[PDB]
Ligand binder design. Sequence first.
Ligand SMILES: [Zn+2]
Lengths: 670, 766, 210, 195
Amino acid sequence: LLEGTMNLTGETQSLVEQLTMVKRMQHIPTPLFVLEIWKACFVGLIESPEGTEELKWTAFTFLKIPQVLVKLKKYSDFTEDVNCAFEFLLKLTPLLDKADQRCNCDCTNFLLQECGKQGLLSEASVNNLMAKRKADREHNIQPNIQLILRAEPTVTNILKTMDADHSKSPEGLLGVLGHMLSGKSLDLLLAAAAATGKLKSFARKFINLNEFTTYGSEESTKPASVRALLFDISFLMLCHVAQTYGSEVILSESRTGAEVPFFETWMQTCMPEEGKILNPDHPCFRPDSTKVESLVALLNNSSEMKLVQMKWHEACLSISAAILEILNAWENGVLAFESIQKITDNIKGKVCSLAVCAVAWLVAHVRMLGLDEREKSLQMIRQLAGPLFSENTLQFYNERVVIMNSILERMCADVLQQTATQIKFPDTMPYWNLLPPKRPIKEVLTDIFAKVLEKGWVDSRSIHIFDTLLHMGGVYWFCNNLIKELLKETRKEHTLRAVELLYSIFCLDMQQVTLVLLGHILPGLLTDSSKWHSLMDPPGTALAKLAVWCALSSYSSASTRQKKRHREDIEDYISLFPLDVNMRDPLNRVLANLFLLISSILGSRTAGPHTQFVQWFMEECVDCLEQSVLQFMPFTTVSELVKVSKVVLAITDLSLPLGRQVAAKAIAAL
Amino acid sequence: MMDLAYVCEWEKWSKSTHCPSVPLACAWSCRNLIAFTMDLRSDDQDLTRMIHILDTEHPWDLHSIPSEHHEAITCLEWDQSGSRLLSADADGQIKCWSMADHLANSWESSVGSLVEGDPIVALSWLHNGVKLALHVEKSGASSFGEKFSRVKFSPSLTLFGGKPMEGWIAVTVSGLVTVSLLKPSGQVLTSTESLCRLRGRVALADIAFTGGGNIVVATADGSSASPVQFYKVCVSVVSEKCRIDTEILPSLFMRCTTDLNRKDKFPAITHLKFLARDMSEQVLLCASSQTSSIVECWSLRKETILKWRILSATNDLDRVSAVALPKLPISLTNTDLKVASDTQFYPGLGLALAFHDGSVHIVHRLSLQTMAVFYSSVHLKAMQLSWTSLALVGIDSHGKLSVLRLSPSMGHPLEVGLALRHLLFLLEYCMVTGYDWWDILLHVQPSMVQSLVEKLHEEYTRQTAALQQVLSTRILAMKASLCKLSPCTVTRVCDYHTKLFLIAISSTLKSLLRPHFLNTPDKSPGDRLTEICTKITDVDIDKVMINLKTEEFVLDMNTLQALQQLLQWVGDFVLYLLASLPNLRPGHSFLRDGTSLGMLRELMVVIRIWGLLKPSCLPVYTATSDTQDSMSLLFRLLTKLWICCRDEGPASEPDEALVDECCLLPSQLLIPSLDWLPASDGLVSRLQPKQPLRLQFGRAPPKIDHLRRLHLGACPTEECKACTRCGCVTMLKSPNRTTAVKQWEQRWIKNCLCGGLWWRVPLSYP
Amino acid sequence: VVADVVFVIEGTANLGPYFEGLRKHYLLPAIEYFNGGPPAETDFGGDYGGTQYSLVVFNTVDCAPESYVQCHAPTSSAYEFVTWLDGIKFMGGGGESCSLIAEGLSTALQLFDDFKKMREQIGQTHRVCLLICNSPPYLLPAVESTTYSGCTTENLVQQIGERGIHFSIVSPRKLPALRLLFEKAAPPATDVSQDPRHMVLVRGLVLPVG
Amino acid sequence: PHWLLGNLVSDFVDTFRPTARINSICGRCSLLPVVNNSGAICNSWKLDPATLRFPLKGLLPYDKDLFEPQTALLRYVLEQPYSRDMVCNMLGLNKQHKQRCPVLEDQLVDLVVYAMERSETEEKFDDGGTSQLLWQHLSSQLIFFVLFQFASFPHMVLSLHQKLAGRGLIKGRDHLMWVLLQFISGSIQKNALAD
Ligand SMILES: [Zn+2]
C-alpha cells in the first residue's frame, strides 16, 4: 500500500527485493504472502479517491503487481501457491463485491485473465477459479480496467508511431494529440506507462517533440499556427506529468553536450514543486533587457499577428521579466487596470503555456513579498488564471484550458493558502493540507498511530500524514515518538502488530530511521538506568525484533522529500561515534558502536531488563539471518553470550580462520 | 588579542561512550553566572539533563540543577536581570527556574509552559522596554547622562501603567509560537498559535523585538535553498487571555545559491541570528556544507517598500561550530564608528566564530572582516561573550570549559592613558547599570591600578549630587575589587570593606531610633545627633550625652538587647583602632579620616545612652582594673584623635600625649582580635597574563558570621552562605527568629553589603 | 462610594518589622471604610464600576539590575488586595537611608491616568493615594517612567496635590521630609495615630480616632 | 509482569485470548437500547458505578475496548427524554441513599458542554432545531440528578468552568445560566450559600 501510494513509478526490482526481504524476516508462507499482496491492492483500490488516484491504483493492481509476481517466481512450484492464494482470496466475497462496485465490472475476471497471460496461473486453474467466482457472483461506458489494459499497447504503439512525427505530418500529430487531450485519455496513458516502467521514454518523446517545435521554420500563418499548438500540447502534457509523477522522470540523467532541452531547464529553475521554492531574482528569471522590450511591445501590439516566427523558448523565458515590468508599471500607477486586462488577454489567449510561465514567476514573487504588498499581484493571477478568452482560439482550446486550470491549481495552492484567497478555477488535490491548523503535532501522530493499530493496517491518507510528519518534525522526533507509543503497550498481540506496522511506516526513510534507531534511541534506552524498566518482556521482545529487522533491511538496501532532505543533511558520523569494511559509511559505524554497547552490557554486573533485551537482540539476529549484520560483532561476545546463556555461536562468528578458533573454544566449552 | 584565563575540566567523568553527542546550551547572565549543559553520560542520561551554574569568580564550585527535562535541553536564557533562567527542551516543557532563598546555589522552578511533543527551537524573554546606548565619543564628557542614554524603546505588552509584563515567547519546530505572561500574582497565561496558515518546518528560528512592541521571529527550515521567512507577532491581553497576532514580513533567499559557478555547495543553513535582540533589522545567516561555511549579514532597509539586501559575507571558512554575538549596546552610527576606529575601542563590534578546527575568529559586525584570531593549542561547541564583551566563555568537544579574555583594542598596543580611558569607560557603564565588572578586572594590569582608582574618584565627584548618592556602595565595591589587584595597593581593601560595614551599621542604628515626639522639628534625630556631636567637642562622654534629649533615644529593651553583637563590634573596632595608632595594618586609613571617626563618636554616644537604659546591650571589655569606665576612656581618646582631623585643611599629625595614652591601652584593656572581610579566594588576583589556570571541577585550588557578629565554633554545626565577591560568611537561617533585629537582618537577604550574591557553602563533617 | 484606591509601599528592610502593626491599625481599617465590612472570598473582580484597589511597591537602588517598581493591576476585590498586602516580602536595603519615592509616585500617577481613561461613566471620583514609607526620599529625578521622567518628588507631589488626588502618609517613624511632602500635596482650595511614635496624616479617608 | 517471569506469563495469558473471544458479544460497545420508562431493566445494560465499565465474567484477556469506560452508552441514554429510572438502574442508584456518584457527574458536565458547543454552532438557522429541546431536557434531567445529591452542585460548576475556560464558547450562555438558575431557585433554601 505504501508503494502504491507514494511511488507508483518505482522500479519493480526494488519492490521485489523489499518483499523478499520481508518474507525472509518474518517467515511467511507463499500463499499467505500473495494473498496479502492481493488484499492490499484491492483494499487500496476501494479506498482510493475518485479521479487520477483511482486510475493509478487500477494500473498498480492490474499491471505492476502481476509483473512483480513474475519476478518473484524467477527468483524463487509458484503456480500452485498463487492458485492457493487465489482460492484464499475468492473466499472473501464482501471485499470483492465492494471492489466490483467501484470497478463497475467484475475485476477478478480481469485479474485471472491477466495472471493467465503472465503465466503465474495454469489455464485449468484460471477456468475453475472463474467458475467459482461466477457462482459466487450470482448471489455503455467501458470500465477503467479495460481502458488501461488496452491502453498499455497503445502506449507502446504510440511510442513507435510518434518517433517519426507521423512521418513529419504535424496536422496528424495535432489531431492525435487533441484526441489524447480529450477526457481522461492522457491520464490513462500515463498511468499505464508509469505502472509499466515506460514513463521515462514517454517523457523523452514529448521533450524531443518540444525541442523540435521550439524554433519552427520559415512558414505562413497556417503552418506556424500548427507549430505553436504543438508547443502548447507538448508543454502542457509535460507539466502535467511533472506535477503528477514527480519531476525526476523529466530529467535526462546524462546529457552529453550542453544541449539540455528547454523544458528541462524551465522545470529545473522555474516551476514550483512541493519541496521546491524558487528565487524570483535568480539569474534564470533575468535573461536580457533587449528581448523583453520586444516582448512587451509584442504583447502591446495586438493579436500577435507575428506568431510565424517566435522562438517560443525565448518568449517563455522572457515572460517573467515582462510581467515584472508590467507589475512595476502598475505599482507606480502609470498603467491602468484596463490595459492590464489587455496584456493578460494577449498572454493567455493564443498560447496557454505563456500563462503558466507567468503564473510560475508570479507565485515565486508573491511568496517573497510581505502581507500588505501582495494585493496587486494576486489580481494578475486572477486574470491569467481566469476563464477563457474567446473568438481567436487556435484549436482544442477548452481542453488546454482544463489542463491549464489543473496546473495552475497545483502551482498556486500554497501561496493562496498563506493568505485566505479563493481563485476558484472550476478534487485533483486529494491529499493536500492534511494537518489541523493549530494542534501540536504529537497529538496528530499518536492519534493516527492509535487508529492504525486498532484497524490493523495503514491507510493511504495515514501514509500521507505520516510522510508529512516525518518531513516536519524530523527523523529523530518521529522515530522516538513512535517507539514511545510502542513501549507503552502491555499486550503481546498489540506489541507484535505495532512492530509489524512500524517497520512499514519506517520504510519511508529506512536508512535514516535505522541510524536514529540504532544510534540514538537504543543506546539511550540501554544506557539510562531509569529507562530500562520500559524494556520489559512484552514490548521489549517486539522492540528487539523491530531493531534487528531495521538493521538487516538497511544493510542489504525512498521518497522525494527524503531524497531532498538527506541531500540537505550534513553530519560527521566519525565524530559522533568515535569508536574507542569501509567504516566511513555511517551504518557500519552505528552497528559497530551498538555491538560494543551490547558486549559491554553483557559483560557487566547488575543484570536487569536491559540484559534480557540484548539477549533477545542477539537471538533474533541469529534467527533472522540466512547466513551480514553480525560481521561487526566483537569476538568477545562469542565468549560472553554463553556465559549469560550453540547456534548463537555458529551463526554469529562469520567463519574466518581465526573465527573458527573462537567458535571451537566456545562450543566445546559450553 | 586572546588569552585563556582558565580551563576547567571534569575529573574522570569524561569519556562519554556508546551514546552520541548532543548540542549544548550556554548562557552568561548579567551577574556573572554561567548556566550551561554538557554531555556527561555516566550511569545515567540525566547527566545530560543537568544545568550547571558556574559563578565565574569561583569556577571549581559548580552547582548542578537536576532539571526534570525528559528530552535534551535546547535553549537556556537568563532574565533581563540575572535572577531567573528559562530552559526549554525538545517536547515542549519550558521551565522557569528561580532562586531558592536568594541563594545562587539553589534553583527551583514553579512556573512553566508546555506544548507537548513539539520541540522548542527558539526561546526568549519578553522585552521590558529598557534600552540604553553608549556614546564612546563622549567618554571624557564628565557626566553619565552624556555617556549612556536611554533610547525610548517600548515594551511588548504594557499592562495598566508604564509597567511591562514579564513572560516568554517560544517557537517550536512546527509552525507554532507560544507566549506565556506571568502576572504579578502567581498566575500565568499561555497562548499558542500557528505562525502562518501554511504550516511548515521551522528548523532554525530566532526572535528580535522592535520599537512599537512587536516581536519579529525568523524561521528557516535548514535547506539553504528555501527562503528565510519572517513574521511580525503582536501580543495583547483580551480581558483574561493572551492573544497573538501574526503577519508575514518580507522573506529573503540567500546568496551562494545564485552564485551559478558551483551553487550546490553549502546546502545547510546552520545558524540564524539577529544581530542583537531589539536590533530586528539585521540578520546573520550561516550556510554550511560538511567542511566549509559562509556567514552573511542582511538588512531590511526600505526603498517593494521593504526588501532584504546583503551587507557583507565572508569568503570561505571552516565549518562554523558556534556563534556568539555581543551584548554591549554601542551606538553604532558613523561618528562613533570613526572614533572607535581612531581610539581603538573594539568591545561592541565583534562576533566570535568558532570553527571545527581549533581556531576562533573575532570578526567585525558590519563588514565581516576578521579582527583577531585565536588558535586553540577539539572545537568550541558553545560560545558566549560577556556583557561588557571583554571575555568569552566556551564549552569544547570534551568536558573542557574555558574563559578567554579579548583585549579591548584586539591586540594592537595602546598607550596607557587610552587603556585607562577604555577600562574606566566600561567600569562607569557597570556602575550606572548594576552589572558585574569581573571581566574588566581580567584586563586590569597591576601597574595601572592606582591611577585607575584615582580616575574613579574624580568621576565620583563632578556628578549631580544624586548620582553621588546612588553610586556610593558601588564605587566602594569597585574600589576594593580594583585595589585587590596590585601588591602596592593590596593593603587598603580591608579598609574599604570595613567602611561599607561602618555605614551599614551607622545608618541602621540611626534608623532604629523613632523619636517619640518632635522637638526642634525639620531635623530628624540622626541629623540632630550629628550636629550635636560635631559642635560639642568635649572630651568627656557625659558632657556630650547631657545635651542630646535622651528621652528620645528609647527602644523597647528587647531589640535593644538583641543589638548586643553589633554594639560589641563597634566597641571592639574602636579599641583596636586606638591601640593600633602607635604603629600599614588593617586600620591605617581610619586614623586620618575625620568623618569615620565622627561616626564612631556618634555610635559611642548612642551606645552610652542605650547602656544607661539597659546595661546588657553594652559591649564588654576585659579590663585590667575594676574602677574603670572603659567607654569613657575610649571616647576621650577618640575625641582627641578626631579633633586632629575635623580641622579645615588640617592633616595634623597626632601628638605624643595620644601616642603614649594609646600605648597604655593594652595595659588597661585586652585588644581582642578582629576578622577582616575579604578572605581572598578570587581568581583575578591569582591569574597572570600568558598563563592559564588548569582546574578540576570540585577540586578548589576562627570562623565567624561577619554580618551578625556571632562566633561559630571550630567546625560549625549550622550551615552558611558565603558572598561570592568579598567572601563574608553568614549562617543561613537566623539563630533566634523571635529576637532578631530585622532592620539589620533584612538588609542582606538578597545580597551581601559589597553587592555579590550569596552562595551556599557545604558543611565539613570532619 | 466609588473609589480609586492606590497604595504606595516601600518594600525595603525598613518598614520590614513595622508593617504588620501598621496593617492592623491603619491599612486594614482604611480598606474596610472603602469596602463596608471586612472582605471574605465572595468579592469578585471585573465590575469596572465600583471601587478599584491597586498596589505599587518600590525599592531602593541596591536592587541594581532589577526594576525599581513592582505594580499590580487594579482589582475590585478587597480580598485579593489583602492577599497582595500579605504577599509583599521586605528584603531590600543595604548601606543607605533613602529610597525611591519618586518612582512609586510616578507610577501612581500613571495608574491614575489609566483609571481616568477607564472610568468615563463618572467624571470624577474619590481618587485616594496612600504612601506607606519609612524613609526620606532620594534626590534622583524619576528615571523609570514615561511622561513623568526627570521630575523630583516635589514636582510629582505637586501634580498629585493639584487635580484633586487625596494624598496620605502613614509612617512608623516620624520624619521631616514626609511631613513637608504631605504639606505640599495640598488639595486645590483629628489624631488618627494609635501609637505616638507612628506619623499618620490622612487628607482623605476616615480611620477610627485613637 | 515481573522482569524475571516475562514471556513465561505474558504468552500464557495470550493463549487465553480465544476463550475471551468466545465470551464477548461482538459490537457490544455500539449496541444501544430503546429507552422505555417501564422499569424491569434487562441486566445487559448495567454498568459499573465506580468506573463506567461493563461488568465482565472472569479474569480473561478481553478485548481492549471492553476495559474502557462506556461513555457513549451513558450519553445516549442521558440525551433521551424520560430516561430517569433507566440511568439509576444502569449505575445502580437507589434513592434511599445519597452518594455523589462521580462519573455520572462528569458525564452530566460533558453533556452540558456538548449542548453549549451545539448551541454555538448556529442555533439560528432552525428556531426549534433540537437545541432548545436539548436545553429543556437538560434542565429536567440535571435538576433530578443534582437534587438528590447523586451529583453535587459546586464541583459540577467548577469542573464546568474548567471545561469552558479558554474554549471560547459564547453564543448560548443564557441557556446555561437558565439551567443553573433552575438549580439555585430549586434548592437555595436547603443548602448554605457557599455551595
Ligand atoms: Zn560581600
